[PDB]
Design a protein around this ligand. Structure first.
Ligand SMILES: Cc1cc2nc3c(=O)[nH]c(=O)nc-3n(C[C@H](O)[C@H](O)[C@H](O)COP(=O)(O)OP(=O)(O)OC[C@H]3O[C@@H](n4cnc5c(N)ncnc54)[C@H](O)[C@@H]3O)c2cc1C
Ligand SMILES: C/C=C/C=C/C(=O)c1cc(C)c(O)c(C)c1O
Length: 431
């Protein structure tokens, strides 16, 4: 009977796991770490991701809502962060509004560790094998089933292998290799500086007009998001600075060590010196010492497909993205939903051949591949729009609004139900 191996207990892998559990599909999660750690990064999930969470199972969405914070007002105001008018005190200034982005079906943010902790409560402990660092995959000569080989020297068998193992996926290496020309994530030239302050502090400094909703402050070479989270009485400040430099290469198993460097507030101060009072004040609210996150994506070196034989990729393993149109983790949840649904059809059969397993994964890839590639490219472009890379969009508000509203519609307002039904229709025709 049909066994799914999930490699990696990140958001993608855990979401899939709950999906399979609720559909009575046999699986095991293989996780290299001793536990799921404590990475507390804020991830914003968009309406499409929330629908996918619910379709996986109500408890996946519940796990998220249990820990997520809604911003005070639900529209994102795009402003020109340079041409703020009226005063040098943000409390008395007028924001230079470009356009308002209304989200249909809500966005919320959570700490990654909080959501993981929630989802993990719905997965039996025996379904997770820790200290299982996937190193290679072979085919069983006798059975033709997949053979996972771990760094500890042990093996395991499965009918399908789902690489949910993140931006530096070993499953991806198994499928396509890891030479200099191989598919991989590379630096997107975007550096993130993040901080949380009391909402009362932000209001004191900026005035309640500027803390009453999310605001994305656009400008030359850099942008800031100020996101009021009234239910934890916090203001989240996120600054992204565009960096034409390459990112210093470090050889390390740790993504934190690979993608993060110490910084000072001065780097942000300098980056936003030509911006208006609101942005300068927001950046001033950072700690003096902080970290900078180098954002990597798979724009330049994508994978050619998400499936090959009995093996496939989901989440950051398949399509690590910039977060400029919401966290890529959300589209990992879409991936997990399609997989959960297709794998459940296979699990219902008494015997599943290698051929049929491979065809099923191919259907998953056909459904997700181009939409995923578009996420990576569109999110990159959104960052270029917000940092005025090729145009001063402060002078082209209506053109900017049409571009961002359209890209957001394509990404966020997707027919999640239709996606799954399409996958299953195609699967039914092909097997
Ligand atoms: C420092 C840092 C800051 C970030 N900040 C943001 C942010 O601000 N916003 C945002 O949207 N996203 C952010 N992210 C990314 C976010 O964490 C992921 O996009 C999200 O978790 C979805 O990734 P995933 O589930 O596909 O894979 P991951 O979260 O990478 O999970 C992969 C899992 O697989 C495991 N694994 C890896 N290789 C193997 C192997 N060979 N065998 C077994 N297990 C393996 C890992 O231990 C991990 O548990 C950040 C990431 C890092 C590292
Ligand atoms: C268009 C989308 C955005 O401008 C956008 C970007 C980020 C990073 C974010 O977190 C949110 C909620 C957003 O809406």
């Amino acid at each position: 009977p049909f066994e799914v191996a999930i490699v990696g207990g990140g958001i993608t892998g855990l979401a899939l796991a709950v999906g399979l559990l609720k559909r009575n599909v046999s699986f095991t999660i293989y996780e290299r770490a001793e536990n799921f750690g404590e990475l507390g990064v804020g991830i914003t999930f968009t309406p499409n991701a929330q629908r996918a969470m619910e379709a996986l199972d109500p408890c996946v969405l519940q796990s998220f809502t249990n820990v997520a914070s809604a911003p005070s007002g639900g529209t994102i105001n795009f402003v020109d962060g340079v041409r703020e008018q009226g005063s040098e005190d943000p409390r008395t200034s007028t924001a230079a509004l470009l356009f308002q982005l209304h989200v249909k079906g809500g966005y919320k943010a959570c700490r990654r560790c909080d959501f993981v902790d929630q989802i993990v409560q719905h997965i039996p402990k025996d379904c997770v094998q820790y200290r299982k660092w996937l190193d290679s995959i072979e085919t069983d000569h006798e059975s033709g089933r997949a053979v996972l080989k771990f760094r500890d020297g042990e093996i395991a068998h499965a009918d399908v292998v789902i690489g949910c193992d993140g931006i530096r996926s070993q499953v991806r290496a198994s499928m396509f290799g890891t030479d200099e020309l191989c598919p991989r994530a590379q630096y997107s030239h975007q550096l993130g500086y993040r901080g949380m302050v009391p909402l009362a502090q932000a209001t004191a400094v900026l005035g309640p007009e500027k803390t009453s909703s999310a605001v994305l402050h656009t400008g030359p070479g850099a942008f800031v998001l100020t996101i009021p989270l009234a239910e934890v009485h916090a203001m989240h400040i996120e600054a992204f600075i565009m960096d034409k430099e390459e990112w210093p290469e470090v050889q390390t198993s740790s993504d934190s060590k690979r993608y993060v460097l110490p910084a000072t507030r001065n780097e942000a101060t300098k980056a936003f010196a030509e911006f208006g009072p609101t942005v300068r004040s927001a950046v001033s609210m950072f700690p003096e010492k902080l970290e900078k996150w180098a954002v990597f994506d798979m724009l330049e070196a994508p994978v050619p497909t998400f499936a090959k034989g009995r093996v496939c990729l989901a989440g950051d393993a398949a399509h690590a993205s910039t977060p400029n149109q919401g966290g890529g983790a959300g589209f990992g949840i879409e991936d997990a939903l399609v997989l959960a649904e297709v794998l459940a059809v296979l699990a219902e059969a008494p015997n599943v051949s290698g051929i049929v397993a491979s065809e099923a994964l191919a259907v998953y890839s056909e459904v997700r591949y181009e939409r995923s590639q578009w996420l990576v490219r569109s999110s990159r472009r959104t960052g270029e729009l917000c940092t005025w890379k090729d145009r001063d969009w402060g002078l082209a508000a209506e053109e900017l609004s049409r571009d961002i509203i359209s890209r957001s519609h394509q990404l966020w307002d997707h027919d999640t139900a239709g996606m799954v039904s399409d996958a299953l229709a195609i699967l039914g025709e092909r097997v």
